Each structure stands twice: as structure tokens, then as C-alpha cells.
């Protein structure tokens, strides 16, 4: 008897450390992982990240992930970073997984670079009124 838990986090940095800052910060979180509940550090689109965890007890999982992004928040704050919590720990169903996979694939398709070899442009009308 298991269960899936999901959370949503926003992290960014605009100092001099750069991405090497956040890359250093995020790998702190899975460094704080417990022995039996594993946490996956996944990205769907920057500056957003998704936390997913399989567990058997709700309270311990939610508490450990909570202290997880708490230490991430303090660490990124030490680097003049940003930290936002959007979607709280919550029990997850199969339909949630299917819809997140669908939107994941959709956004991946949108982000892809499309060919622009076309020699014709619509440029005789570019007004904004």
C-alpha cells in the first residue's frame, strides 16, 4: 500500500554565481533525502521544478520535503536568489500524472526549434492599434 505526493517549486538566481548557484542548491535537496523515501528532482520548464515522492506514511514524507525546500530556500537566499512555493504537498492520482505528462509533452513540442528557411515574410502590416 503506497501513495504518490507532488509539490511545485520556483527557484532562480540573478547574482554573479549564475546557474552554477541553483545547480549547487538543488543538489542539496536530494542530499537531504532519507534512506527509504526517495525524492526526484525533475524540471518541466524553467524557472519551475516539480517534486515527486513515493511513500507509505503521509506525515513523514510531507515533513521531510518541507524541511527540504526550507533548507533550499535558506541556501538560495544566501546567494541573493529567489524562492516561491506554489502547490503544497498533496496526494496524487493517476489522472494527475496523465495530465501532467500531456502538458509536459505539449510544452516540449512548443519549445522545440522550428525551421525558418521560408523566403516569404508577412511584414507589410505590423501595426499595434
Amino acid at each position: 500500500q503506497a501513495v504518490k505526493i507532488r509539490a511545485d517549486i520556483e527557484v532562480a538566481c540573478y547574482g554573479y554565481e549564475g546557474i552554477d548557484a541553483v545547480k549547487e542548491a538543488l543538489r542539496a535537496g536530494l542530499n537531504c533525502s532519507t534512506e527509504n523515501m526517495p525524492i526526484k528532482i525533475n524540471l518541466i520548464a524553467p524557472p519551475r521544478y516539480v517534486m515527486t515522492t513515493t511513500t507509505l506514511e503521509r506525515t513523514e514524507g510531507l515533513s521531510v520535503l518541507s524541511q527540504a525546500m526550507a533548507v533550499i530556500k535558506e541556501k538560495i537566499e544566501e546567494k541573493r536568489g529567489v524562492f516561491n512555493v506554489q502547490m503544497e504537498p498533496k496526494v496524487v492520482t493517476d489522472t494527475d500524472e496523465t495530465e501532467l505528462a500531456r502538458q509536459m509533452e505539449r510544452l516540449e513540442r512548443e519549445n522545440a526549434e522550428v525551421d525558418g528557411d521560408d523566403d516569404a515574410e508577412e511584414m507589410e502590416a505590423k501595426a499595434e492599434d
Binding site: 543538489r27 524540471l43 524553467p46 511584414m123
Partner: protein, 453 residues
Amino acid sequence: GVTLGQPHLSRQDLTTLDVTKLTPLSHEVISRQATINIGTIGHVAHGKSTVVKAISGVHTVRFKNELERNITIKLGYANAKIYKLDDPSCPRPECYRSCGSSTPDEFPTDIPGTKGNFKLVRHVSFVDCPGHDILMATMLNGAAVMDAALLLIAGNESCPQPQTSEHLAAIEIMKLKHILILQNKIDLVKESQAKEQYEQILAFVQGTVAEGAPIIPISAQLKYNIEVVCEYIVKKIPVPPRDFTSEPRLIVIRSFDVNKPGCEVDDLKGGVAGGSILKGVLKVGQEIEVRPGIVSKDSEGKLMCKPIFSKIVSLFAEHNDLQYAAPGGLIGVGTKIDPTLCRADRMVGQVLGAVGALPEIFTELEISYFLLRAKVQKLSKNEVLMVNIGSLSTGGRVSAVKADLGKIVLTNPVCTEVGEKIALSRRVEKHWRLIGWGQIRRGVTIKPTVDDD
């Protein structure tokens, strides 16, 4: 520096790191990167994409939903390495082999009946644009760096259209003479029409710096009977002198991110920005900044400026892996900035240079404008219009006019050195057709918001 890319070309040494080369003709540049950029013009009825692909291949890319800006200029470019065939008795174009950049610097001849090993001439990049007025507007203000130009003069049309007259007007403004006019559609055009078009070409090239330019016909619509260009791309090889060592400055023309969803923490990469380096030599591991930075209208209304900086980690050109880049061509850099700012060409029109190379950042300026067309109205006092600078379009607010002079404020921050060029276009009909251009005379600096914690 150090640059191999593929075993076809040898590897440079990151040991000496000396600017003493100072030559467009170096062994590991004419084969490595296209330092000589050439433009192609001709407007309509020719389809220059086909003739450009005939030597290089498919070019230009887009994003559909560019997002954020949606105003970045759709300028396309490609690379090609010209390497003439070596033959003791070559009935030209039998001394031609030029193709893409895959072939090594000195390729072993495999032509029937002869052998040997033929060298190259000079790596060349080609630049084009699928729009008529935008291309001249963009290279008017020093955004498209080039040393020569080509014309397709379509043969499947009537006597040279006013598009040609616009093109000669622009090049006359540019004070450049290394322009090769290339007749088109010789396959469909018969002998009499070819003679008529030739006579029209001679009768219309007079009075311009392009007079006397080599004219040669190419059947580009069928992409067949391409021998003449196959020989005169080697024969017509004017010297593009170039100066290299100075200070590193760059203009970003586009930006994007290579990361994909589902990527783990250990495989996260920074955003990438590709543009054209104007002058100076860029180094891997060097220090680079962007002067305008993040703009943020505070409670006062002043921007935030903040010329953010991060060390450059990776540089490349096309598909190869190059370090210690040199001016010429178009180059991308994988800086260490967070991709959340570098995604989907978020900010275009920036600058890139070493520490301490921050120019003036004026927002109120004065210009010297020139009219071009015949009769035209003078500059309008207290008017709203659009201004184009570097690779950047915005809506300015002209304040005062001293007859043939103008003082104007900008609604957005702008990083520029005094004395550069500027383009002005008026909102008319359902678009903004270009009206004119000028050179900036002097500029009152914006509030010095360059600050750090």
C-alpha cells in the same frame, strides 16, 4: 587559442595566446570559421535562398512563437568553405571544388584523370533576409557586418524594378563598391532577351560605384548550368582587409536554451546567446557583461540597469567546437546566466564586452537626419514614431527640432556610443514604412543606475 572541431583541420594551441596574427589569412581561420561575411540582395522574383543553398544548403531558423520580443529581425546566414580544385591543366571551372565546411582544409583530389591535393581560399559566410526594407534598415545602422555584396537581378521579370533603384540607393549610402551583379534565369531567357537585359544592366549601373562590376548569368531557378559562378567564385576574390585586436564588443541577434524537460539536476545547462562579434578577440573563461541588463521601472520610474556578468564557459561555431573566437561571421556563446532569462530569445539588442568596456547609456539624444527618396516634408515637431538602433526597435518621443536637427527622448533604456547611426520609421497606413536615417550627434546621459550590492 585552441580549436580543432573535427580531425579534418588541425588543432590550435592555447599556449601562445598572442594577438600578433592580425591576419584574415591564417591557416586555422580560413578553414575553421567564416571571418568574411558577404551579403546578397535582389528583393523579388529571384529566390536567393535557392542559390545560397546551392553552395551551402538549408539556412535560417525560426521559433514561431518567439515570445517576449517578437520584434527580433529575421536575418538569416550560412557558412561555406570555398576550395578551388588544383589541376595542372584545368579548363575552368575544372579548377573548382567549393562546397560546404565538411571537407578538410586540403582535400585529396579524386577527379577522374588527375590527382593531387588542393587547398582552400578563404572561409566565407553568406547573409540574407526574406524582407525588402528590413534588410536595408538593418545594415544601415551597422548591425550586419559585411565586406562585399551580390545581386541576383531576376531575369524572369520586366526591366529592372524600382526595387533595384532602392538597392542602388542603399549601397550608394553605404559607400561600398565590391558588389557583383549576377544575371538570373538564363535558362528560360532566350538570346535576344538576354542581350536586352544585359543592355539594361549596363544602362542602369552607370552613375553608381557599382558601375563596371562583373556581370555573369546563372540559371538559378533550375539550379543547373552553374559553371560560371563555379569558376568566378574563385576568380573574383577581392581582398577583405580586417583589423582584429582591440577590445571585445558583441551584439546579440538571438538567444535560446538547449535544456529539455525531464532533465535531471546534474545535466542542467545554461542559456545560449548567438550574435555577431564586432571587434576584439573573445576568450574562453573570460569576463563579459551586458550593459543595459534588466530594466525595472521603480517607484521613481528609473530603470534598474544592473549590467550583470558571468564567466563564459563554452563557445562554438556551427557544429565545431572553437575557443578564442575572432571577429567575423556569427558566433554563439553558452554563458553561465540562468536559462530562465536566456529562454526564447528573451532580450535582444543587448551588448557584450569585457569588464570596464561599458559605453555611455544615454536616453535623451540629438541626431543629424538625412532625407532620401525628391520632395518630402521636414521632421515633425513633438511626434511619436519608431526608431531602430543596432538590432532593436522601439517607440521614441522626439522633443524638439532645430530645422534640420532633432532632440528626442527614448521610452526604453539604450546602450550606445556617440556618433553611431540611427533609423527612423513613421507609423503610417497599417505598418511603419521607413522614412529616413541619420547619425547621432550628442547624447545626454540617463541616470547612472549602474550599481551593485
